[model samples]
Target: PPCTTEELSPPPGGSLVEYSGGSLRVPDNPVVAFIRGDGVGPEVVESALKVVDAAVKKVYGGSRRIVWWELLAGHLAREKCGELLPKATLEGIRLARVALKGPLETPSLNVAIRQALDLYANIRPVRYYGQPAPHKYADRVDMVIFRENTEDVYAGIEWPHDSPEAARIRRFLAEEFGISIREDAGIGVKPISRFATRRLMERALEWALRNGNTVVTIMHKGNIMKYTEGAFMRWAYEVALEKFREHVVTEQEVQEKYGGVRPEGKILVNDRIADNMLQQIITRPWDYQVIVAPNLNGDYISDAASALVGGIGMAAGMNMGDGIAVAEPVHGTAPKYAGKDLINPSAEILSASLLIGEFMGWREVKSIVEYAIRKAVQSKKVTQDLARHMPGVQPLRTSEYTETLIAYIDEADLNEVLAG
Candidate 1:
């Protein structure tokens, strides 16, 4: 009904996935909404879709599959439907409550969609799977970042220095708050409320507890921004202690009561200054497991952590709220490689794995996708991005890499599944 202008229809024989009572009720043949994105988005998405479909077929055979419902967005939408982000696209995702997407052209579009849907938790899981990484500790770097998605400076609450709106705020601050500022200064406010902070922390804690992850480091810049960043760290700890009393223990408690020996069963809720957290991740990557942070800090650390493994090409992310979730690759659309069939598709395929594994309860399908990627990477015949690093290895086209993954998926037994 919301797609009146586009007159779009859900793919036939595929039932809509309903989200109710804090869970998704998915059908055997679920309708998955997807955005092919911009530039190389179409090619990379096609490659990912083929692998996902192959995995589902390999695991469930004829019993299950995804019927993709294409939702227009970004350049494709503007060219086809004459709108960047159409109503039908947003409504289609809302109806499905889950989607797999490629990268958008700009941060604004991604941010706009996140704000529109209030997807507050940006979950980025960084792990090494035999891919070539810069750091030696790449194999040891397995961490999930739970980033606050909808708040902080990303809210875009700012005015230019030359604007009248900036002068008004400058005068108000100088007169009312007795705070002086330069006339040429631009201003932006970082809003980190107890409500938003608590919810993000709650979800992160829930994820850590459910997944049996021991450490939940609340990364922040509390030394500088005490009220906002510091409050985020304090509030996260408060929530973990108050809500998950039996399951969580503060780092201080571990030091004082347990003599610095972390208790086996409890998750260690700890905090680190932002700059130090960055340094720690590189020097001592294994010290952290699950990291929770404010928007900007989270964005910085997530990308930094991805570098430790194999960059964004191997990094997969998902934005989630109460019921709905959108899975996307962390990499951008490489415009230079738009139709060249040279861009890496591992990130896109892995993102789809997250959608199937975490959201759709298809763990086997996720395993199969990941297993195939790992095997393909080990084969040393990879996409140009990866092939350039190794000698005596032939680079594959994007389509060829997809075929490699599918071939591996078909050849390997389920027992070769990666560890959960």
Candidate 2:
């Protein structure tokens, strides 16, 4: 029997995973909500679903499976549901507690969805998998960026330069605070709260400890945006010391006490100016592992880091809230590439891998999926996006790329169990 809500019906033969007592209780057949996004979203999502199913079946046989409940959003949503993001769609995700999403159409839709759900932690794990990269040191760039999703410039608290609200604020600033304001200048409020900052940092630090990550760098432009960005850095350090004191060591402590050699089992917590960190990620990518940042800085860093490895075509990201998560590709919906069966599906596939491995506790699924992706890319038979970058290679169609991934999944599964 299928579960029925206000305007959605989950597929039969699946159980909804519920979050209780601070953890998710997953059944053998968990119903996972999926949003087929705009443009190439449907194609990549279709491809990712195939790879996910293959890995799940390869690992658990008939015991475990995902009943994907299709939810409406983006252009598809507007077509079917008469709105870009309907209340039912958000309710569906909330009910499921975990979702795998494709890229949405506009920036506002993405922001609105995240804000509506309060999905405050945006995690982008940028890693190298022997893919053809722009630089030689792409091999060394493996970093997980924890971006505060709800605050800073992404908060969407801006007014147009000529708006009445802008004029009113300009006058108020000049009259009350005696701060000079250009009459024609637009304004956007950047709010960085201790509450939001601490939670984001705590989550990042906890993840680092659990995942055996050695360093967590606080990425900020605190040097300039003192109150907003600066406080983000300050509060992040406080969270590390307050909650994860024993598990974390400061960079100063590492240098002064350990003679620049980090002690064993201690996660080093450091801060870097946003601009300099960009250069450092290129020059010394290996130095950083986990980065915690405010909204805008994270937005900038995640994209730049993706460029270092293989670009957003393969960068997987997830927006995480209390107990809910929406995993999606970091790239946008490429309208030009839509329906072509030619764009790369690695990003969507890898995003699903993160959802399965991290949230679903099906770690083996991630291992299989990631291994297959690595193997597929290394084979030189890839999709058009990657094929163009590599010399002397033929690009496979979207379906063919997915088929290649499934074949590699079997090979990976075989090696994991059959190897001596």
Q: Candidate 2 on 1-420: residue-level lDDT in tens?
A: 122346567787899888877667889999989888889999988888888998889878769988888888887777766778888888899988888898887746887888888899999999888878886799888889999988888777999999999999999999999988798899998899999999899879877876789999999999998999999999999989999889989988987989988888999999999999999998999899999999888989999989878766788999998878999998899888888888888899989988878667887787778777778788887888888888888888889989998998776545564333
Reference-based lDDT, residue 327, model 1: 93
Whole-structure CA lDDT of model 2: 0.86
Worst 10 residues of 2 by lDDT: 1-10
lDDT of 2 at 242: 95
**lDDT (tens digit, per residue) of candidate 1 on 1-420:** 223446867888799998778556988999998889998888888898899998888888679978988888888888877878887887788888888999888746887778777788999988887877888898888898999988899888999989999999999998999999899999998899888999999989878876689999999999999999999988998888899999989877988999998899999999999999999999999899899999999999999988878765668899988778899988888889989988899889888988887557887887788778777778886898888877878899999999998999888776556454
Instruction: Tell me how candidate 1 scores on lDDT.
Output: 0.86
Off by over 4 Å in 2: 1-4, 256-259, 413-420
Clashes of each: 0, 0
lDDT of each: 0.86, 0.86
